[PDB]
């Protein structure tokens, strides 16, 4: 069912993302919060899956990946236009100014204010530190049942 990792099967993971300086681009282990990696183009791209296969539960593996296969492609789909009136309480925002914003899951995601319009604010929720090659460690804590 989910004894070992397979293509299009999700995994419960504790991981951390490291730059060449070994800098933490993203953590999902130090925060004490695990995450699930949805295999099969369900959330992550095949590139990540294709390097995760063959491992078993209770093991951990470190591997490198292209941006798309890591933090994915930056996503204009999250772009949302709010009013300046919504930002004024925190000061009128700037063009190309990325400030930490608040998702529904409470998660504070980076948000690049793309442009400032006289009545409206151009917001741009892009992804994590994507668009660059990053080294990450990934643990197999438990594998999600493949009901294929």
Curated annotation (Swiss-Prot):
It comes from the Bacteria. GO terms for biological process: chaperone-mediated protein folding; protein refolding. GO terms for cellular component: cytosol. Keywords: Isomerase, Rotamase. Residues 2-72 form the PPIase FKBP-type domain. Belongs to the FKBP-type PPIase family. PPIases accelerate the folding of proteins. Substrate specificity investigated with 'Suc-Ala-Xaa-Pro-Phe-4-nitroanilide' where Xaa is the amino acid tested, was found to be Phe > Leu >> Ile > Lys = Ala > Trp > His >> Gln. PANTHER family: FKBP-TYPE 16 KDA PEPTIDYL-PROLYL CIS-TRANS ISOMERASE (PTHR47861:SF4), FKBP-TYPE PEPTIDYL-PROLYL CIS-TRANS ISOMERASE SLYD (PTHR47861). This is FKBP-type 16 kDa peptidyl-prolyl cis-trans isomerase. It comes from Escherichia coli (strain K12).
């Amino acid at each position: 069912m989910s004894e070992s990792v397979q293509s299009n099967s999700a995994v419960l993971v504790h991981f951390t993302l490291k730059l060449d300086d070994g800098t933490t681009a993203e953590s999902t282990r130090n925060n004490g919060k695990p995450a699930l990696f949805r295999l099969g183009d369900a959330s992550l791209s095949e590139g990540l899956e294709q390097h995760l296969l063959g491992l078993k539960v209770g093991d951990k593996t470190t591997f490198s990946l292209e941006p798309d296969a890591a933090f994915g492609v930056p996503s204009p789909d999250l772009i949302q236009y709010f009013s300046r009136r919504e930002f004024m309480d925190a000061g009128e925002p700037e063009i190309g100014a990325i400030m930490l914003f608040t998702a529904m899951d409470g998660s504070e995601m980076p948000g690049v204010i793309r442009e400032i319009n006289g009545d409206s604010i151009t917001v741009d929720f892009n992804h994590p530190l994507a668009g660059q090659t990053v080294h990450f460690d990934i643990e197999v804590l438990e594998i999600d049942p493949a009901l294929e």
